[PDB]
Amino acid sequence: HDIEGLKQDFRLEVGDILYRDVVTGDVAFFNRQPSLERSSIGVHRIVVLENPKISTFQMNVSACAWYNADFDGDQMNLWVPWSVMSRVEAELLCSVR
């Protein structure tokens, strides 16, 4: 069901699946190609930038050592886990710590 075509419900029914927006504090897999080391894909806590004019993936400069990255024009992938099973394992196994 859509959310714009469905506005007659006071609350939700138990068992439903809600596809909510990504918020600050969510974990995300963050990758740069080529992936040579196994630290090339790491899990970071998302900080959502409220500025509508920002279109870049910002990270601390000390975090570039994981990905062998720099800011001369590199592009990096990012996918946010949504499944509970994949979201658990991102926090416990794939965290950049």
């Binding site: 995300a28 963050f30 740069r32 970071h44 806590r45 998302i46 900080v47 930038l49 920002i54 279109s55 870049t56 993936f57 910002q58 990270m59 601390n60 400069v61 000390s62 975090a63 990255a69 800011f71 024009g73 590199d74 592009q75 990096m76 992938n77 990012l78 996918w79 946010v80 949504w82 965290s95 950049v96 710590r97």
Partner: protein, 43 residues
């Protein structure tokens, strides 16, 4: 065009459709510096 031509090379069946994958729910953008973010945080 042949059935067995689909297999071998990098753009072949094995290395492009099986060992690799096109996925949804993924994003790409240029990276940037931000000294106010933690090492385990991404803007």
């Amino acid at each position: 065009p042949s059935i067995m031509r689909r297999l071998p090379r990098k753009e072949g069946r094995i290395r492009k459709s099986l060992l690799g994958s096109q996925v949804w729910s993924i994003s790409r953008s240029t990276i940037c510096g931000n000294s106010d973010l933690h090492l385990d945080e991404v803007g």
